[PDB]
Write a protein that binds this ligand. Structure first.
Ligand SMILES: N[C@@H](CCC(=O)N[C@@H](CSc1ccc([N+](=O)[O-])cc1[N+](=O)[O-])C(=O)NCC(=O)O)C(=O)O
Ligand SMILES: N[C@@H](CCC(=O)N[C@@H](CSc1ccc([N+](=O)[O-])cc1[N+](=O)[O-])C(=O)NCC(=O)O)C(=O)O
Ligand SMILES: N[C@@H](CCC(=O)N[C@@H](CSc1ccc([N+](=O)[O-])cc1[N+](=O)[O-])C(=O)NCC(=O)O)C(=O)O
Ligand SMILES: N[C@@H](CCC(=O)N[C@@H](CSc1ccc([N+](=O)[O-])cc1[N+](=O)[O-])C(=O)NCC(=O)O)C(=O)O
Ligand SMILES: [Cl-]
Ligand SMILES: [Cl-]
Lengths: 222, 221
């Protein structure tokens, strides 16, 4: 609304979560308009935005092609998008199959295991009132542990599920690229070779590079 | 496989996450056996369990009614059970509907918002190598914020989605009951009246009380 795209995607430019959804929209050739919700100015707690998400966090999605259907939680947004619109199953497992729920498994690992613990690392590095080395260390270690989990699997198979790149793989990309800068003496390709190759393979895709490049642009300027 | 139940449910007794799955299994008349994986002995990091879940955390599920299908992540386990076995849709939204994805939304809020932040509150209270009041406060405030979000919604509608109790609602129960007993001088019913009523309504269900009673038994002297 105010644009002619199928989706409105409300996100904060610095966040991992909205760009993840952008990746998936790009893969599926779905038109979207990015609507910036600036967490730095507390806009995610604006009453207008909280009408979209009572949690008052980015991102959120409106599907103008489905009666302006509103949905939040980035993982749920991805799932909605892929399930409804990836009917050829280019990048997703078919709903109502075993593999679908393995796909779901990995997305919950992303959303509950990668996101929150990566996020606490950033928090205690950048944002917490006190600088607390033991807290920074905690979530550094946990980030590395997450990498080791991915490596455990990816060293033995190309993709997380179904023998192809899916929304399961894609979901990890944004956070994994962001977290590198927050780890000391860290050589991603050296420490986790299979995970690194997997990561940088996806990031090379124009469908993923484009949105990520736009994040970069948006962030270069205040 | 040593028992004749449809499901092996691997959980740690003290964790919120396994019992959640139990709730759903009970609701859906599905037979299961609980297999305790003892985090106190680091059993979740054993080679045997890590074959089930490379993440090396509880819980995990084996569906012996589906060729010993193995799945982990408690929210994914719930969705699998419900989607496959709630054919009359007693407590779940139909796959391939808008409401399914609102249902999924709320489960992700549970899994990514309630769980991890509640967990960090417990961690910095009990387990961290040093006491850090600013860290405890952070996650104590976040916990209350989660309650606030539920209250914002549940004070204006009975259930989270679809006008009935679903796995969306059920998913919150175990962590909520743990945190409200965890927190000192906290009057749940006073502080968040709609959420409290919604909470205790579910906990009164025999299908939910049964597993929760078993947890309390296991947790006790
Ligand atoms: N004050 C708010 C955050 C305000 C803020 O500055 N937000 C950041 C995003 S947080 C953030 C900041 C840096 C990185 N990072 O890639 O290193 C990741 C995240 N993040 O969202 O997890 C932002 O808008 N930056 C815009 C810009 O850079 O121009 C808080 O305390 O959480
Ligand atoms: N589980 C949700 C998580 C959404 C989320 O984390 N949203 C953040 C994005 S911004 C963000 C996300 C991560 C981090 N970080 O520090 O890791 C910093 C920032 N930030 O803008 O300051 C947000 O709105 N936070 C503001 C708030 O909670 O009030 C999802 O996947 O959609
Ligand atoms: N070595 C492990 C210890 C694991 C452990 O012993 N489990 C805890 C439960 S963790 C826990 C403790 C308190 C609360 N709580 O909400 O009060 C929630 C959780 N939890 O598992 O989420 C426990 O009390 N069991 C041993 C016993 O009962 O003898 C660690 O440090 O994390
Ligand atoms: N997202 C996953 C979360 C799984 C999870 O948290 N598992 C815990 C359960 S025990 C647990 C869960 C929460 C808390 N807590 O402190 O809140 C304490 C304990 N504990 O046993 O010490 C675990 O295995 N932890 C051990 C590990 O990571 O190595 C899911 O929903 O399945
Ligand atoms: Cl976002
Ligand atoms: Cl568990």
């Amino acid at each position: 609304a105010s644009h002619d795209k199928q989706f409105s995607l409300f996100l904060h430019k610095a966040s991992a979560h909205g760009w993840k959804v952008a990746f998936v929209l790009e893969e599926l050739s779905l038109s979207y308009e990015i609507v910036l919700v600036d967490v730095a100015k507390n806009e995610q707690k604006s009453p207008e935005f909280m009408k979209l998400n009572p949690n008052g966090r980015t991102p959120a999605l409106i599907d103008h092609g489905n009666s302006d259907f509103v949905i939040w939680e980035s993982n749920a947004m991805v799932q909605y998008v892929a399930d409804k619109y990836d009917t050829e199953r280019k990048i997703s497992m078919a709903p109502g199959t075993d593999d679908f729920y393995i796909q779901l498994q990995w997305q919950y690992f992303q959303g509950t295991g990668q996101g929150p613990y990566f996020g606490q690392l950033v928090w205690f590095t950048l944002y917490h009132e006190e600088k607390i080395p033991s807290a920074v260390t905690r979530y550094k270690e946990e980030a590395l542990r997450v990498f080791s989990v991915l490596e455990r699997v990816l060293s033995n198979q190309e993709w997380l599920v179904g023998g192809k790149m899916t929304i399961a793989d894609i979901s990890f990309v944004s956070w994994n690229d962001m977290i590198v800068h927050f780890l000391d003496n860290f050589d991603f390709e050296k420490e986790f070779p299979a995970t690194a190759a997997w990561h940088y393979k996806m990031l090379k895709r124009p469908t993923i590079k484009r949105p990520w490049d736009e994040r970069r642009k948006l962030m270069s300027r205040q």
